């Protein structure tokens, strides 16, 4: 049905790509997202980091607030998605 | 919203270098519906900035009046984040 590959998502990514530091991310993402949406994105990213650190689901749920349903969905993206989490994890390590 | 865990997400977003990498990363982190709502707000924001009517905006983007009103609220009383990115995309263009 619905698909993310479109001209409009392309333009949204152009906007994201011009953000230069964390302050500009708060400025932009607070305008475009609700607090709950941005917190949900941050929670998934934290869950992905802990799954890659081989932590248990209880450890993950305690630290991140995530339910098993949310953890399972990140886990599925992690193991069967685009390798996008691992892409940014490596690049962040290079950085320092 | 200002936490070390949100900082961490933003460090990740900042290491993306092109549209292909954004598709890679955001398709893993967001659902289809989430990414499409964000893109919809961003197009609404653009058309609002260009003084298009709610009518013309709904028809072009499918956004509800509630959606359009929220984006408008953001343009009026927010951080000027939309404005910041619009300006830079125009200069890349020029």
**Closest CA relative to residue B1, chosen from A70, A88, A42, A32:** A42
Residue identified by tokens 């081989």 is: A54
How far, in Å, CA of A75 to CA of A45, rounded?
A: 11
CB atoms within 10 A of CB A29: 22
- Domain borders along chain B are 1-94
Does the beta carbon of A93 lie under 8 angstroms from any beta carbon of chain B?
Answer: no
Residue of chain A minimizing CA distance to B84: A28
Question: What's the reported resolution, in angstroms, to a tenth?
Answer: 2.0
Sign of the dihedral through C-alpha B66, A7, A4, B25: negative
Which tokens is A75 given?
């886990």
Task: Determine contact, residues A66/A75, Cβ cutoff 8 Å.
Answer: no
CB atoms within 10 A of CB B87: 12
How far, in Å, CA of A26 to CA of B45, rounded?
A: 17
How far, in Å, CA of B41 to CA of B61, rounded?
A: 9
CATH 1.10.1270.10 describes domain B1-94: yes
How far, in Å, CA of B33 to CA of A4, rounded?
A: 9
Residue identified by tokens 């009518």 is: B55
On chain A, the residues whose CB falls within 8 A of the CB of B80 are 27, 31
Instruction: Find the CB nearest B78 among A4, A14, A31.
Output: A31
Task: Determine contact, residues A47/A60, Cβ cutoff 8 Å.
Answer: yes
**Closest CA relative to residue A33, chosen from A16, A11, A8, A50:** A16
Q: Which CATH superfamily does the domain covering A1-96 fall into? A: TrpR-like (1.10.1270.10)
Residue identified by tokens 């460090």 is: B11
Which tokens is B19 given?
């549209």
Which tokens is B72 given?
């408008």
């Amino acid at each position: 049905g619905k698909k993310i590959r479109t001209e409009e998502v392309d333009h949204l990514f152009e906007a994201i790509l011009c953000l230069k530091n964390k302050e500009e991310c708060y400025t932009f993402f607070e305008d475009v997202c609700t607090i709950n949406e941005l917190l949900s994105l941050s929670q998934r990213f934290e869950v992905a980091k802990m799954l890659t650190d081989k932590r248990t689901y209880l450890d993950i749920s305690e630290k991140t607030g995530a339910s098993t349903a949310t953890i399972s969905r990140v886990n599925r993206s992690l193991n069967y998605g685009n390798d996008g989490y691992e892409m940014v994890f490596s690049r962040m390590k290079e950085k320092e």
